[PDB]
A paper describes a structure:
One of the more noteworthy aspects of the oxidized C-cluster is that cluster ligation involves one residue (Cys301) that is strictly conserved in CODHs but is not a ligand to the canonical C-cluster. To probe the effect of Cys301 in DvCODH, a DvCODH(C301S) variant was produced and characterized. Similar to what was observed with MtCODH/ACS, DvCODH(C301S) is inactive and does not contain Ni, as assessed by CO oxidation activity assays and inductively coupled plasma optical emission spectroscopy (ICP-OES), respectively. Unlike wild-type DvCODH, DvCODH(C301S) cannot be activated by Ni under reducing conditions, analogous to what has been observed previously for DvCODH samples grown in the absence of the C-cluster maturation factor CooC. To investigate the architecture of a non-activatable C-cluster, we determined the crystal structure of DvCODH(C301S) to 2.0 Å resolution and discovered an intact [3Fe-4S] C-cluster core with an Feu ion that adopts alternative conformations. Approximately 70% of Feu is in its canonical position coordinated by His266 and Cys302, whereas approximately 30% is in the Ni-cubane site. Thus, in the absence of the non-canonical Feu-ligand Cys301, the cluster cannot be activated by Ni and Feu appears to be free to occupy multiple sites. Taken together, these data suggest that the novel structure of the C-cluster that we observe here, with Feu coordinated by Cys301, is relevant to processes beyond oxidation, specifically Ni incorporation.
The anaerobic, Ni-dependent CODH has a homodimeric structure containing a total of five metalloclusters, called the B-, C-, and D-clusters. The C-cluster is the site of CO/CO2 interconversion and is composed of a [Ni-3Fe-4S] cubane connected through a linking sulfide (SL) to a unique iron site (Feu). Here, we report the crystal structure of the CODH from Desulfovibrio vulgaris (DvCODH), which reveals a surprising and unprecedented conformational rearrangement of metal ions in the C-cluster and provides the first visualization of the cluster in an oxidized state. The overall fold and cluster placement of DvCODH is highly similar to other structurally characterized CODHs.
Residue numbers in the entry:
A (entry chain A), B (entry chain B): 4 to 628
The structure:
Amino acid sequence: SKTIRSRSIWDDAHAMLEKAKAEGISTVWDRAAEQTPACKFCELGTTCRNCIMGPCRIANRKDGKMRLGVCGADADVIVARNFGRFIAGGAAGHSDHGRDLIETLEAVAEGKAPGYTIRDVAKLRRIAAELGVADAATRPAHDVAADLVTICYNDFGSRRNALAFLARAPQVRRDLWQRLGMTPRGVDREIAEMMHRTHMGCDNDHTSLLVHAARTALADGWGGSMIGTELSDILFGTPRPRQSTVNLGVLRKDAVNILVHGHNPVVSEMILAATREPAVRQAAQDAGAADINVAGLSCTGNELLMRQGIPMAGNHLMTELAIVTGAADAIVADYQCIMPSLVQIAACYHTRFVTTSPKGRFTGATHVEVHPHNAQERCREIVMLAIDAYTRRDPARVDIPSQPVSIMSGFSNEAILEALGGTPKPLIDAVVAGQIRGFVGIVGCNNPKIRQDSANVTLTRELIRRDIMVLATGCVTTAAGKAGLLVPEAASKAGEGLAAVCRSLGVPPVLHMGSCVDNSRILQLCALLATTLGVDISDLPVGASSPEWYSEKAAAIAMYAVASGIPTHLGLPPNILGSENVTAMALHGLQDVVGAAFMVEPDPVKAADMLEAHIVARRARLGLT
Amino acid sequence: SKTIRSRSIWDDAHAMLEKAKAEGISTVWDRAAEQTPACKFCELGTTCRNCIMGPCRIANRKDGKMRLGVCGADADVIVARNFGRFIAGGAAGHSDHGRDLIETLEAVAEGKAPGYTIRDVAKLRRIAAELGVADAATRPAHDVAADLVTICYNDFGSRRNALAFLARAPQVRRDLWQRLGMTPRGVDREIAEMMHRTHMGCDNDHTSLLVHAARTALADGWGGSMIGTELSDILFGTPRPRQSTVNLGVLRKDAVNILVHGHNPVVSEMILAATREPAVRQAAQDAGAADINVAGLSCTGNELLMRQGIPMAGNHLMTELAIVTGAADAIVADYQCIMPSLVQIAACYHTRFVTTSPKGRFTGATHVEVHPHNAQERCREIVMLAIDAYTRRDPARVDIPSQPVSIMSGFSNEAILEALGGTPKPLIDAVVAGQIRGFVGIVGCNNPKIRQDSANVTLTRELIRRDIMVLATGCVTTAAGKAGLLVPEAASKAGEGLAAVCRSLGVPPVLHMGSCVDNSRILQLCALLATTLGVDISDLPVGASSPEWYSEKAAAIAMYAVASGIPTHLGLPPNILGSENVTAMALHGLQDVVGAAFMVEPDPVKAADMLEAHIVARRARLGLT
Ligand code: SF4
Ligand code: SF4
Ligand code: FES
Ligand SMILES: [Fe+3]
Ligand SMILES: [Fe+3]
Ligand SMILES: [Mg+2]
Ligand SMILES: [Mg+2]
Ligand SMILES: [Mg+2]
């Protein structure tokens, strides 16, 4: 089918799209086609539902009617409020994610989380001392853990003037944030204030609204996401470079296949541990299987890739197609980006769809709730359900379409600094010498509006050929991986200078830095380079890009990158084009305020030119050629 | 004129609607007409904009097309998520309001709030002892205040299992909330979790979404709103019964008229203090004015009414018309329900439109930001701006249309118990005897869809006639006041049992209990009666109603009343009718979850019948003969 080829660049997607057609299974692409054309007002953002004096739409009519909402709000306020709440939903997703890590570490500290431990005691002591815990280096690890928990919880309270991790940002940046009123003070507080501001008759100034959206996104990047990342490393180990594989071919016909989907490693690590217990493995063999095979989806797949090397079956738009292989015996979900269609598709097979979080409820799913005190017991129970489902798999409907592609993962900042010999000097020398011209974090999702991974891959290829090193997170990981970009030998794909540096360090030209919360690592690394050099983040030769974004979380990531000084490309526009003032603030006005702005460009080669031009401009202001 | 009489029941509204039409001033009614018909999908709730795989619309078709969103979400999920975020917006308004009160009491305890003090030390010592402050009766007041501030701030953190004021609810109700997973744990936390739940691919079950909507609302009523109410009494005095007046005729031609609009008394109490300084009054006398006249709008007006007896100019739909009088020399606004059209109407006169809050920014307004450390100095500056605006008032454009009408205000729970002799027994005895059959809180807004105050007033009259005492708060206060029902002589309008009780106590049949946050006084009073009788709130002959609601805050108030066991009538439907399952849950399902449910009924006599019927059934539950 020509339509099927138009939907993805990957062979495995085409194979499963053909299989779904022959079986009568509708996909995300079919539903997108039904939802086209979209409502013009919703698309432009010129519609409001925030009270029942409405709902309102802002139109351009020759009689001048419908220029304002019933309360008097114009298109600038309505668009800005809609964008503000959109960002707040993304920040809330990462807020709750980090809060779960705090609760988990606290349970470990009190000895009430069987099977969870402090995997990286050294990092616990370093992070705790950094945040002010007295005698963190010498006191018993659990006492230090309880004092660190208290610090992170205070960031989720209402008495701080600035988040604890904000100290990593250079002083010039903290001074500018304070001057603009952008300093994030509380992870939950900024979210709550955004919902108050967007109520009828509170914040009715588009500038002020976008300013607080930046403060809310900063409370994510330097708060919710950074806490989640750093505590995840403490509980489950700091990532280190390791080999693994990617694509639908990671599923095995001869094994029980358990797909982990969602976001939080507190569940996926414990599922993986369950499948490794000898009695559970023996139950799989009693059922006729050779082994139990865990395969990751989306960000929780990234978490297992980074710390355990678990192969990843696919990213966002592969999630339905992974069930269409007919070889998934269970999908285990927690929260965020889990399309509810997956429940219906799993019902077309033997596959069990298991929910684990009180926040991630799906009508028709099997719910086995996981908490720190019962995780070890419950995850054992979930794996036993997958083995039971395996015995009823229909072999006639199994089609695992491809051979897996080799990848390298595990590039935390600790691993990067280890590869460099303990200091960022060799990396700074490479940038000053022009071998590495700059860095671009390529982040974010897939979106049915764009042929899947076409922009992700093209942009990655363009940047490394221009001696720009790519830091990959989120669903871009799978795209870079399937394109053969995540291995040390991929230096052959990069420009002469980047390839030389990569070969001298033994690293790939695209560094997998983890999940979407792990974009906080990109913030930490920028802050480190800026502080070492004595400049602002907005002076560094850096950029960020989400060529195929879809979610509120991706928009919050883009906003905190911009607000931290990182020019940020988006493949598609947010629903803001109904207000030229808001659009001009996002694309230009922010540049004059925070030192960076949004870019919207659907052509990935054009996007490469723009990100490169920003990097060239910033190199010149550092005195570099 | 027929159209004009159709828009309000009041003479002062009629006069300003004529003046507004003659002057070409666009009102909330004119814009509501332009926005009719509304978008069918928006009004039904079957539209989603939570990610850019969409936006999506759900149609009902036999062919099954557009039955699901791009992510596969159906109408139940889309409607429930929309209503969840709607509720969260209202809870957030009360959250930030209560938070501002904590910060003010802290500044007083620190000695860093010139012009503020602990007005009610006895209540501070009583609230602090109640919440667990050690030696609250003897330790220095500022030490006790600091320990209370710590407790309230902890309820804005992420470490509690249940909010501090939740201990007021009866044990049976606390046990049900705990089993349902509905117990409010953190004011900001429940708001953030709702925004997480409503992100794509998180909570995709309408029952679970509605249960957290209840938890989020309960974090308002027993958290943000109850903290706001109790600290306001501590900082500004516990209200006690007093007389005052209402309507546009409270503005005086010979005086500088300052309208306080918005919500937080932290601003309006200091505006009033400023108008009493001898030097400032001399400046007004220099300008030709005989006095400085402060008058209240909406909830901040309710606050000044309850504690200082300051006359009230109007409620929500009177706000624009108050400027149309041509005698408003300044509007002093903070946040919530402040229609931005007021800025344009102010621009049509001499009136200064002054914003005071970093959250309540309005393009084109004069911003004089107020915080505890500078309120005394800044509020003086604001009054001077009003005096200067007075000098430019055009006498020929002034039309103050009515003479003010007498009311009685200040019925805090402390005031009610004092009137009863110290204990609630005389009220309990009157209910047992059937002199008072029950109590209904009539709360909430005006809405252009309903002839202003018509349903508010008709419901109030119907209920007292049936021996049901009415507790009024919010913008219903102005309606009851202008109807002449807020005075002890209104006993002649009540049934025989209610009139005898009111005359023996010397109180009106309609008790003004304060602002929207003071709906927490109604929760406190229901909890007291239930604990005294040893029953649940869902056993009490109580009810709640908002016949003309508009705002997210009102929907949140209705939800926390429903979730606390109080049957709640709404005059208009939330945007949920696109899902029969969500609608059936709101109107029927919740009875079997929380012991109460919503009602939607635009006929206020019908609404009285339904509220009365619930009261009859609850009297039977208590064995009353
Ligand atoms: S807040 Fe204003 S623009 Fe939005 S729905 Fe209500 S009246 Fe319309
Ligand atoms: S969350 Fe689902 S229903 Fe809502 S806009 Fe995105 S794809 Fe459409
Ligand atoms: S669906 Fe109502 S405006 Fe888009
Ligand atoms: Fe992601
Ligand atoms: Fe109100
Ligand atoms: Mg715990
Ligand atoms: Mg500021
Ligand atoms: Mg203070």
